[PDB]
Amino acid sequence: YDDLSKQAVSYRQISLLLRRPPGREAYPGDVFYLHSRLLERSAMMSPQKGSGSLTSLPIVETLSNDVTAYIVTNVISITDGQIYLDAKLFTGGQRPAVNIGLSVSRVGSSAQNKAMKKVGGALKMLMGEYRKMAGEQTSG
Amino acid sequence: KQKIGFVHGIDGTIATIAPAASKVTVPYNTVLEIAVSATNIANALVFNLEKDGSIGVILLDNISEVRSGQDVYATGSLLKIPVGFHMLGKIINPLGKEIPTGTKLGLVEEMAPNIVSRQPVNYNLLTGYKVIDTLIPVGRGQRELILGDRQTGKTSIALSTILNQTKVNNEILSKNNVLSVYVSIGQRCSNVARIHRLLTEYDAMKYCTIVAATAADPAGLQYLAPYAGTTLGEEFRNSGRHILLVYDDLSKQAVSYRQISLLLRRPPGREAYPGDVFYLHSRLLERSAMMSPQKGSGSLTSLPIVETLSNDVTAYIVTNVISITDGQIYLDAKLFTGGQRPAVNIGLSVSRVGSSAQNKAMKKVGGALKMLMGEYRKMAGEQTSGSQNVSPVMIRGARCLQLFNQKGPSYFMDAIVALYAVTNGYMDDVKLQYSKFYEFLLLNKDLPVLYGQVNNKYFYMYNKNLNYFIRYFGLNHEILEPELKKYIEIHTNLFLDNYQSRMNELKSDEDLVQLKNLLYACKRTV
Amino acid sequence: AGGKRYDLFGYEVSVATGPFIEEIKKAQFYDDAGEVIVKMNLANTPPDLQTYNAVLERILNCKSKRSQPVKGENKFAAMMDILEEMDARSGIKPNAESWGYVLKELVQAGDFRLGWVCIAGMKSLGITPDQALVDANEANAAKAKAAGTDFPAYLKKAAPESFDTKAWGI
Amino acid sequence: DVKQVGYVQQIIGAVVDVTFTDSVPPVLTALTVDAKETGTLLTMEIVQHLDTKTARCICMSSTDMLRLRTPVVNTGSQITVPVGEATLGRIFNVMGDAIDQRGPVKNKVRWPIHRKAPTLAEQSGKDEVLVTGIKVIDLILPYCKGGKIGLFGGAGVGKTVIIMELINNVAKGHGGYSVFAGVGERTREGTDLYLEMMGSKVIDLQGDSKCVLVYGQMNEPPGARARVAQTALTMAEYFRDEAGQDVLLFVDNVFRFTQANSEVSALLGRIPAAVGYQPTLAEDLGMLQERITSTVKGSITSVQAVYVPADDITDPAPATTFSHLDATTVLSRSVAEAGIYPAVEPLECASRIMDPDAIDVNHY
Amino acid sequence: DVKQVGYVQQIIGAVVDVTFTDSVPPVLTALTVDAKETGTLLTMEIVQHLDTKTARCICMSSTDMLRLRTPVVNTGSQITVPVGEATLGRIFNVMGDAIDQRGPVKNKVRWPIHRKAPTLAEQSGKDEVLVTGIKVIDLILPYCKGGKIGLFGGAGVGKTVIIMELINNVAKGHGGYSVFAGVGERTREGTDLYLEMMGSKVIDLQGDSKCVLVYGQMNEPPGARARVAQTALTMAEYFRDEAGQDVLLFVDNVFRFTQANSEVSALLGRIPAAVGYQPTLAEDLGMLQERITSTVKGSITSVQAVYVPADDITDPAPATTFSHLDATTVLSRSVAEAGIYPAVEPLECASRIMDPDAIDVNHYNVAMDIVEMLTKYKELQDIIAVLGIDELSEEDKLIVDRARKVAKFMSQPFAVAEVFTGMKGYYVQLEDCVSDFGSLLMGQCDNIPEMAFYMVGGLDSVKEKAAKMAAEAAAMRERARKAAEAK
Amino acid sequence: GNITGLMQLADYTYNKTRKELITAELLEIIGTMTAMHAGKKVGLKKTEFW
Numbered sequence A: 001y002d003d004l005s006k007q008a009v010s011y012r013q014i015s016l017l018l019r020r021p022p023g024r025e026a027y028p029g030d031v032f033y034l035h036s037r038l039l040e041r042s043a044m045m046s047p048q049k050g051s052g053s054l055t056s057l058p059i060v061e062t063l064s065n066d067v068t069a070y071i072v073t074n075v076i077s078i079t080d081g082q083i084y085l086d087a088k089l090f091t092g093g094q095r096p097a098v099n100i101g102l103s104v105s106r107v108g109s110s111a112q113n114k115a116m117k118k119v120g121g122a123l124k125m126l127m128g129e130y131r132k133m134a135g136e137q138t139s140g
Numbered sequence B: 001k002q003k004i005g006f007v008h009g010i011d012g013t014i015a016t017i018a019p020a021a022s023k024v025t026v027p028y029n030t031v032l033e034i035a036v037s038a039t040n041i042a043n044a045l046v047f048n049l050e051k052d053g054s055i056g057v058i059l060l061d062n063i064s065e066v067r068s069g070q071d072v073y074a075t076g077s078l079l080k081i082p083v084g085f086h087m088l089g090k091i092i093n094p095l096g097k098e099i100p101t102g103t104k105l106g107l108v109e110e111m112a113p114n115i116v117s118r119q120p121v122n123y124n125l126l127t128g129y130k131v132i133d134t135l136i137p138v139g140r141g142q143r144e145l146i147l148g149d150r151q152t153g154k155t156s157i158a159l160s161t162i163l164n165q166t167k168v169n170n171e172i173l174s175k176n177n178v179l180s181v182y183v184s185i186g187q188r189c190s191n192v193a194r195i196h197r198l199l200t201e202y203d204a205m206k207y208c209t210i211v212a213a214t215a216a217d218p219a220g221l222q223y224l225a226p227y228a229g230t231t232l233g234e235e236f237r238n239s240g241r242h243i244l245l246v247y248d249d250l251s252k253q254a255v256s257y258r259q260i261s262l263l264l265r266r267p268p269g270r271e272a273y274p275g276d277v278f279y280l281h282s283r284l285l286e287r288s289a290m291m292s293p294q295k296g297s298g299s300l301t302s303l304p305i306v307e308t309l310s311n312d313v314t315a316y317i318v319t320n321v322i323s324i325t326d327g328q329i330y331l332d333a334k335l336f337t338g339g340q341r342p343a344v345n346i347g348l349s350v351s352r353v354g355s356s357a358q359n360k361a362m363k364k365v366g367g368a369l370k371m372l373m374g375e376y377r378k379m380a381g382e383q384t385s386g387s388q389n390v391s392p393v394m395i396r397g398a399r400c401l402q403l404f405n406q407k408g409p410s411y412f413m414d415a416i417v418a419l420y421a422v423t424n425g426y427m428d429d430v431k432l433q434y435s436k437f438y439e440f441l442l443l444n445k446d447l448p449v450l451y452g453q454v455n456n457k458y459f460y461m462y463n464k465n466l467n468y469f470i471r472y473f474g475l476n477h478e479i480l481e482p483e484l485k486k487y488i489e490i491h492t493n494l495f496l497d498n499y500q501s502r503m504n505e506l507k508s509d510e511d512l513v514q515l516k517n518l519l520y521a522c523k524r525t526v
Numbered sequence C: 001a002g003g004k005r006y007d008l009f010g011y012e013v014s015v016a017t018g019p020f021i022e023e024i025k026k027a028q029f030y031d032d033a034g035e036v037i038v039k040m041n042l043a044n045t046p047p048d049l050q051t052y053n054a055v056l057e058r059i060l061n062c063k064s065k066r067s068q069p070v071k072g073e074n075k076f077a078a079m080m081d082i083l084e085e086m087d088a089r090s091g092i093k094p095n096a097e098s099w100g101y102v103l104k105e106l107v108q109a110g111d112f113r114l115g116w117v118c119i120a121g122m123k124s125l126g127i128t129p130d131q132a133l134v135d136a137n138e139a140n141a142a143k144a145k146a147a148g149t150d151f152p153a154y155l156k157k158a159a160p161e162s163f164d165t166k167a168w169g170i
Numbered sequence D: 001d002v003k004q005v006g007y008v009q010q011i012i013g014a015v016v017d018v019t020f021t022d023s024v025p026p027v028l029t030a031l032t033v034d035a036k037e038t039g040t041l042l043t044m045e046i047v048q049h050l051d052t053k054t055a056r057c058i059c060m061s062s063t064d065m066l067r068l069r070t071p072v073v074n075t076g077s078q079i080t081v082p083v084g085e086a087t088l089g090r091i092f093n094v095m096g097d098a099i100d101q102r103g104p105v106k107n108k109v110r111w112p113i114h115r116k117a118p119t120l121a122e123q124s125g126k127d128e129v130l131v132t133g134i135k136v137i138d139l140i141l142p143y144c145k146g147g148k149i150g151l152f153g154g155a156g157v158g159k160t161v162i163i164m165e166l167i168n169n170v171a172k173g174h175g176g177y178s179v180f181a182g183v184g185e186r187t188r189e190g191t192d193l194y195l196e197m198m199g200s201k202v203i204d205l206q207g208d209s210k211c212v213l214v215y216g217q218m219n220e221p222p223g224a225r226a227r228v229a230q231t232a233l234t235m236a237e238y239f240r241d242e243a244g245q246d247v248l249l250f251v252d253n254v255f256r257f258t259q260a261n262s263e264v265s266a267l268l269g270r271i272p273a274a275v276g277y278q279p280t281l282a283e284d285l286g287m288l289q290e291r292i293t294s295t296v297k298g299s300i301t302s303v304q305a306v307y308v309p310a311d312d313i314t315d316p317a318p319a320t321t322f323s324h325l326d327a328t329t330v331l332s333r334s335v336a337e338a339g340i341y342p343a344v345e346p347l348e349c350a351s352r353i354m355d356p357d358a359i360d361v362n363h364y
Numbered sequence E: 001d002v003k004q005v006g007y008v009q010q011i012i013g014a015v016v017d018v019t020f021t022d023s024v025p026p027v028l029t030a031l032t033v034d035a036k037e038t039g040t041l042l043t044m045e046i047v048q049h050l051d052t053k054t055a056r057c058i059c060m061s062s063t064d065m066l067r068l069r070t071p072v073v074n075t076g077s078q079i080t081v082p083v084g085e086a087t088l089g090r091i092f093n094v095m096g097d098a099i100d101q102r103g104p105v106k107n108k109v110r111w112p113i114h115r116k117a118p119t120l121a122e123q124s125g126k127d128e129v130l131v132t133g134i135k136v137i138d139l140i141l142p143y144c145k146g147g148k149i150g151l152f153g154g155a156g157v158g159k160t161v162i163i164m165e166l167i168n169n170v171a172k173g174h175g176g177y178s179v180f181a182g183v184g185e186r187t188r189e190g191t192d193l194y195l196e197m198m199g200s201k202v203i204d205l206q207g208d209s210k211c212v213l214v215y216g217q218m219n220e221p222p223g224a225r226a227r228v229a230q231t232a233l234t235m236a237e238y239f240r241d242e243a244g245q246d247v248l249l250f251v252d253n254v255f256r257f258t259q260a261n262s263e264v265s266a267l268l269g270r271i272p273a274a275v276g277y278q279p280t281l282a283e284d285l286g287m288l289q290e291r292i293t294s295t296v297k298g299s300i301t302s303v304q305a306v307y308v309p310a311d312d313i314t315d316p317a318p319a320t321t322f323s324h325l326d327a328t329t330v331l332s333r334s335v336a337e338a339g340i341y342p343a344v345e346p347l348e349c350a351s352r353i354m355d356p357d358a359i360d361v362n363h364y365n366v367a368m369d370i371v372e373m374l375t376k377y378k379e380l381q382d383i384i385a386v387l388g389i390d391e392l393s394e395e396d397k398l399i400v401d402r403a404r405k406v407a408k409f410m411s412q413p414f415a416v417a418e419v420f421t422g423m424k425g426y427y428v429q430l431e432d433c434v435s436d437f438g439s440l441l442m443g444q445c446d447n448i449p450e451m452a453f454y455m456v457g458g459l460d461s462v463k464e465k466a467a468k469m470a471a472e473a474a475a476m477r478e479r480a481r482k483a484a485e486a487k
Numbered sequence F: 001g002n003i004t005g006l007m008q009l010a011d012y013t014y015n016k017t018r019k020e021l022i023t024a025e026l027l028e029i030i031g032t033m034t035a036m037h038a039g040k041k042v043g044l045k046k047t048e049f050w
């Protein structure tokens, strides 16, 4: 899904023209049920139902690196993980501009294969120390 | 007569009319007349005509005297007011009603001139201050803003701009005169009266008039006043005459429009304003223009005033106005508190268009001072008390900012030479504090003629008619250069030998006080 | 007048100016002439050099600015603002007759120091002044030298050696 | 001659709506109802017409036990207040009913409250100085007659001893009386101020008193507090015009007068524009301040305390209040801890009249 | 045949309601009322229907002297405006009525202003760099021929001057028809521009012209500002489709188109959005933007300016407008306070063409570094303003001395601002910009002072400025020497 | 002297954003109140129907 903020902006454009009551940040208020109705359809079916699935990678625009707005908070509330792209890192030269400390995934080892488990289990422990020391200018 | 209906309801200033049984049409933006009493008649403006014949109205006069059962007459006419040369020398309610002290009906609401009727400004407008005519030029057409926090020196600049033009308009023809108008939105009635007595003291009232709308007056009237002053300007504009216009102040107009829009439950916007507040100022400010020769080559200048807060230009109204104006003048309470008066900040100020019109005598000098201050603002900031220096730039800067400290309007001839001395380093031997008394000793007094040194031929300061030669030729001409340089070289040698040595010699504390009284008096008279 | 004048936008103007020069010459107060220019620019009839020169003649012959007097009215600055209007604003440049009226006014006004500047300003532009005027200029300068009126009297008055806000006349 | 009568039609808090059957009375008109039904007197000021026979009005006292369609009397005018020498040394509420218990008041006339501000002619552009008697104020912060003055000071800084000295000096120097206007005043501070005004002989009950007192308290609804400064200001304008002399009009924190009118406007259904203050901020304030101006017939000075909420001058109520002021008399607990009294900090203070164009040069 | 006729119902500002007895026309249809009653002609487009036998509408010209029961004539079509070569070198209003007083335009056909956007099949995003001559625009945010450009900046930052500098560099050096839409801006600017074009023979009236001007300015009511850019796009789309020729669309500026719809939606009864803008912001902006698209027939290189009230990017209108743009140009005010003009903030800026596939490799590897270094300098500004330069490691104060050089080098003087800076305008070529930044990036020029990079173009001009500075410093040393010896 | 400038700049941004937030809460509330009343606006409608 491209920008879901635009899927809420259209919902606002409609409800407000329909003389519905606004809410926080001019939305109707029930937009959380909008994104929940959308995203909870994303799932891994049981083997009874063919063991199929569908992953959702919704994209949400952000303004000035805030996660305090209404829509961003209602979406992060629903989604398992999140991939924070910081402009301060994008403009910092590195691309893709993910900030690992801010970005998480609530699945973990159970998703990736047998080989990536043993690696990422070391990479997390690595970054836990590098994030604490990389703030130091290298003098040694 | 007509009796379209009767006042259903009132909410302070806004009101609502209900129609008569014999329903009749009324137009939009018409002035209505409420029969308040047997003889007293209010005046009110339409803003919407609804389905059932019910009409919304904005009240302007005698709101306290209104009731519900009263009658309502319609003129079938726009919001008009009288206008002409006979209106000059008077102070009026925006609706044309003259206020006391001790035929030609022009429209209030009107469209501005198109691109073809307009023209790039060519002629200057002397504010009388050296800071402005030098670095921030102002032409007859350049609607320029005057920012600054409360109690900063805003209200006095427009006055000084008018007082400077009084000395000239008596001399020159009437065509090149600079009439003036001072619209006071929300300012205290005392300040307006003090201004009236001031302008009557210098006899500047004959070429001026005032449009009064205080805080005691209604809000819907404050919304209307600058349109009235602009109408009085539009008449002299279309008649080929040039004119000035002033607004004190738009920031208090927007509040009065916010009263009405919110009393009518219009949807607000950013910082509580409705959203059409930009169009409020555009209808006004776009009427300021140097008309084309096709239309008379008239003019209508506009010097609005706007109240910032804590020196924050990121406010809504301030930027809505800066997006309109052809300029900017940013006054700072830092400098006003720090002795510098006027408190112009040259970095945050600009005159986008007047440089095309700035006189060449003031232009070649202004480019030099612009270079000088461009260097001073770096040479003073980089060191930040790190390491002082004795350099001609940082010297001449401090010698020039003192000259910029001003109280009243300075003549053009009196304005140039005090700067010409500084750019050419003549005024570097003197100290900081003795630059003002140096200036007064140069302009009103003539040390060479006093001390007998009459080697010069004609160039002297005693006449003041020499201005209109400098205005035509420019000081950098071949003939005005040598007499100017010799006059200044003599004046400097005399000041440095006869006077300044005595000033350094004085040590009695009572003498120093007697001297500082003189310096502050030179600070005032100049 | 086969040549045609245009505006900055490219619009055509009407050089029919004679009637306005007649209305200028009939006037007997030199501010009414500026009001004729005001009645001229409106009709898309910008000024010719004959017009400004007639205006300078009118100021020279007129007795005052208006039916009633005004404080500090000077025929000189009024005769020099219109020259600035000629040169810079409109683009037309004056001629020998133009500056000649100004030098005539300075002679009649008795001022002499401004006269010599009008001389040097004339000559620097290649203009040939008339010696009949500059001779009377030097005559008034010799008189004002003889009467001590070469400068005002209040400048030759000695200054206060002591500093005082009142003694300095401020 | 007879008196008009109306009947209530709806009641929402202190806001009330009154139906009539004839030409509705004017705006700002008083409407009194007898005490037999409600149990006590009740006044209501008309603000907002609604039709050819309806009138919405703010109530000034408690509207409890007010029945619907009760009789409502039109006084024929707006709120009347006493004036005269009997006013002095006494305390008055908004309606002019004394709350001092000190017997009745022997007034001669009873003027209305919402007098329009002076015409431009009645003004006097000549800006004078009030010879105060305090060398700190006379020198650094010359209190300009007809002008609006600011005072910033909390507790333990002698804020009362200053105004008491100002009253005692104006009582003998300029030959003028004074008046205090406690808007939203803490009821305890009313006692501590009136007992000081008996201890300092400012109010000689057995003699001649100098100051009038007007206490609109916090326990009163905002419909009263918004009309308190107009009451005291009428008590002052009577001494301005008829007696022909200078006057002081002291005021409690103007922020509470603005909060009062803001609650009135919010109650009436009007949208609050900004942070929470009414849209009529500058106009409601200006109707007060513009009545405070020098005249050919006399003068009215206005000392005013201010509470800057969260020390933010950029808030609309302080800044809009500052635009009318002429001087700023700051008080500091530092100098008061250094034994200095009056506890003035002349540096941070300022004045508008610091110009030799107005005053003598050597003073400047 | 007969023209349908109706009667007015109510009037609120520019908004009007109309009662058509028999039936209502479609949406966007025009409604003319005679100049007899109001005094001047007046067109009113429908925008919505309240009930049957009714239609709410917006008015172009003023509603003054308008009554409640006036007759309303139906055109039977939308707002039609002329097109063709006759529209070249002429000025027009929102309705296509000319105002230049030159003569009657010899139009042949008239097209409507409201039109559905092109289909996906027609579009063709071709990446071709656009040499403006400007230095920062070339380096960081290179424009793209056929795309869109955005100049985001508050009041008094230098975007209208950026547009004049782009006209002087690109438009005359274009060989293609241009269009200039003034949407709520100074009438003075349109006059200065019509004169700057009438001087360069771009609007040579007695010959061939290569430009069109539309101007619905701030003086006009919002009914015109809300529908002027549509007219300009119609003039451009005619050249895009029929002639199949590259064109330019300079717009100054769309925020007033947005204000116009905001001042309208309030009056129509629409409930507003958060700050107070219309709820139809994204749609009303998209129907304007998506008409600007490069097809196979032609291409439209638009250059739009945008206003940001209170210097607030969180304003929904610019915040919505970023998405529609191929190359953003985020101006700032704190930079202009530092003497730099153009006051670009390249960390905020962005583009689409910035890929090695489109532009050459050196330009990309250089700009990626330039952004990186300024990104570090921003992090250090929070410390240097606290402590100072002396409290930093030698690596850090080096990077500062290099980034101050870069940021100062990003400035240059334009030919338009000769009145302001008093310096001749430079035209920095693309290749010399990359060779200069690459040399400055590898420390090829570190001994050179900081001020030599200020307000200049090309490293040769830098080293001549450094020569002048060293010469003046030595001259002041000889002068202080002789002043000391004589003293 | 530098920390104080940064401090006052932050005190202004904080005290200004606090005001814009208060005003925004008022706009949201009044928008909901005005929408409810405008939609719930009741009229007599004394017009012919037969």
Ligand SMILES: Nc1ncnc2c1ncn2[C@@H]1O[C@H](COP(=O)(O)OP(=O)(O)OP(=O)(O)O)[C@@H](O)[C@H]1O
Residues within 6 Å of the ligand: B150, B151, B152, B153, B154, B155, B156, B157, B187, B249, B341, B342, B406, B407, B408, D323, D352, D353, D354, D355
């Ligand atoms: N050019 C000047 N030189 C010296 N002092 C000045 C000058 N201009 C103004 N002042 C001083 O500023 C004070 C008046 O401020 P001013 O009237 O400019 O504020 P204002 O803009 O009117 O404020 P507001 O608009 O809120 O009334 C006076 O004390 C006056 O002496």
Ligand SMILES: Nc1ncnc2c1ncn2[C@@H]1O[C@H](COP(=O)(O)OP(=O)(O)OP(=O)(O)O)[C@@H](O)[C@H]1O
Residues within 6 Å of the ligand: B322, B323, B324, B350, B352, E154, E155, E156, E157, E158, E159, E160, E161, E162, E185, E186, E253, E307, E341, E342, E412, E413, E414, E417, E420, E421
């Ligand atoms: N190269 C330059 N040299 C000097 N000044 C410049 C330069 N470029 C831009 N400026 C400055 O930019 C300002 C003009 O701003 P501009 O006209 O772009 O604002 P604007 O777009 O009209 O504002 P709005 O969009 O609100 O109308 C002037 O102060 C001008 O000096």
Ligand SMILES: COCCOCCOCCOc1ccc(C(C)(C)CC(C)(C)C)cc1
Residues within 6 Å of the ligand: B151, D152, D308, D311, D312, D313, D322, D325, D326, D327, D328, D348, D350, D351, D352, D353, D354
């Ligand atoms: C030239 O004449 C100037 C006279 O001006 C009269 C009004 O003066 C304005 C002073 O206003 C202020 C502003 C801020 C403050 C501070 C910040 C000291 C008040 C505080 C500490 C209570 C927040 C005090 C007074």
Ligand SMILES: [Mg+2]
Residues within 6 Å of the ligand: E159, E160, E185
């Ligand atoms: Mg612009």
